[PDB]
Symmetry: C3
């Protein structure tokens, strides 16, 4: 997997405009939808139990985010995940806060038991509670245990499936000043999984394309601030090119 192939995946996403069903928290629904629209995907945000099953089945990917949990939204997420599983739609999980509060950890473990996942994206603590050289081993152990793809996020991202491991070096710290920046990335990974057969490559391509857009947006923002960055990021998800990804994406097979 390289920058050249990641660029090709970004073009496939724009070409097909995949329907990406996201069940996420209310602090980031609007931004998640706008980021996906800018990227070139088709967002669908239904979250109620009376319809999530019908939505998930026709989507290109289902993304579950436990940011602002509730007993009911977790149940809807599982109903959606089971429907997605029945119809061969890939499911991506973002176990936000797993290990921080008991309810989050329980909900994350619940989903892992009831839904087969194509990929899980979270920080080291979140992945451990739900499931460097130490980060690489954690990613490999979890990927092998759940027979899935694990993307442990940080300034350096470690992605692993049952047999391979990669480190990615893209992005900008300004992403930490925009709420939903991480949540949107997991949905972008979903958009890529909807067009790329292998979830490991989809994830690498997704994280790389997003990090490049974020870097280019930060360059333009200069010292304007986090408000301008938020708008520039949406602009760059739309204007970032294959050439930009080939030139700035840093993908390393370990």
């Amino acid at each position: 997997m390289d920058a050249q192939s990641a660029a090709k995946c970004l073009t496939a996403v724009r070409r097909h405009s995949p329907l990406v069903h996201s069940i996420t928290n209310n602090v980031v629904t609007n931004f998640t939808a706008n980021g996906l629209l800018a990227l070139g995907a088709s967002p669908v945000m239904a979250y109620a139990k009376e319809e999530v099953a019908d939505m998930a089945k026709i989507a290109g990917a289902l993304v579950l985010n436990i940011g602002t949990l509730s007993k009911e939204s977790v149940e809807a997420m599982i109903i959606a995940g089971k429907s997605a599983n029945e119809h061969g739609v890939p499911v991506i999980l973002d176990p936000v806060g797993a290990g921080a509060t008991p309810f989050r950890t329980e909900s994350a473990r619940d989903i892992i038991r009831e839904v087969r996942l194509a990929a899980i994206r979270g920080n080291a603590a979140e992945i451990a509670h739900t499931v460097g050289g130490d980060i690489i081993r954690l990613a490999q152990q979890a990927a092998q245990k759940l027979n899935t793809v694990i993307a442990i996020t940080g300034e350096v991202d470690v992605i692993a499936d049952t047999s391979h491991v990669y480190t990615l070096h893209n992005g900008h710290k300004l992403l930490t000043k925009v709420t939903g920046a991480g949540c949107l990335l997991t949905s972008v990974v979903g958009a890529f999984c909807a067009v790329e057969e292998n979830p490991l490559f989809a994830a690498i391509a997704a994280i790389s394309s997003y990090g490049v857009a974020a870097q280019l947006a930060a360059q333009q923002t200069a010292d304007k601030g986090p408000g301008s960055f938020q708008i520039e990021l949406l602009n760059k998800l739309s204007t970032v090119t294959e050439q930009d990804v080939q030139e700035w994406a840093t993908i390393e097979r370990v």
Copy 2:
């Protein structure tokens, strides 16, 4: 109905700052409120059953949007609609997704039975499931059946009441890249219905003013992207003038 009269309606909205009660989905509440504030209206977003009745009764217009449905929010919408009906407050419905999932279609038909509507805005499929020359006939048939105003949206908008039909030619494709752009338009139609006696003229004036602002915003955005467009659209809802509407609104009586 013409561009000159539509411009006059826009000035009336700014003058009176109508209280527009919107019960909409969580992906677009913030944008809907901000668009209405920019336009010069007063948004009120209460959605809970314990208060929607009290809110609707003092509003200038009530707008119902079924974007991210739930059994409870539909019930609140009907409670609000009945209250609005009792106090002579016009009710506008946006039956998003009607015909796509069973639950949406059911909920839309439910509202149509329980609440008298001043106007319904949706795409062709949505209007048909809830209720060119073929689009014109659909709008006329539905307007006559429900004794209401039907605004079928597309690149060309077809608006009809029991006896008249109009086609409108305004707007920009960038609206498709901003979540809530359509939802906000239905609430803007509500803002216009709050000041214009005839719901057909209110709708025409609303859609025209919004399309002109969208075109002017797209000109300014140039090739910046969907992030800049979102911000420019809010800017133009605020700065668009009567002169702009007279010069760029395309209204045709069929």
Copy 3:
């Protein structure tokens, strides 16, 4: 309390990046989080009963906003407030709409009975229903009755604790065109209470710093509109300096 000391509080907030737990309405959650991130604080938006207690206990401040009430979210707010009270975490209340509808007034009075508050921020009507020279007396009467700090907002803000009263003269009218601008201010007051021992000084420092950032943002926005202002405000919460606060904050002890 002066502009020089208010500036020092702003630096303390940036230094410590306080965890500010906000339980607010869905129209303003994203903006509240982004404003706090821009300011230099750490927002946490959990609102479900199964976890709010665990969140509140580790936060630097808890802020309750009754904007889009529901029987359940009020109960969660009280659970969170009691947890905050047990662990010495300051609680700030924004009784939006108190006195406008019966349900709001009831909910506000409920919170006042069950949760000890460090500060309450609202307009004159809201403070009266929940609890010039006349505004000053209202603030003093309410502050003395509830043994708390009362910040009555307007173009001129009146802040009072059991024994002192201050008037603040900062801000810009463009704040009225951005949904969540007021709601975000109450959360900013929370961010300041998390680092400043005396809630009266924290509130004065918070409102002053926010008003200065708002004025500077309005200068930059010029005649661009409310969309650009929203983005500029976020920019200025990030870039406003101690020097800016010393030069533009107007604080008067009555």
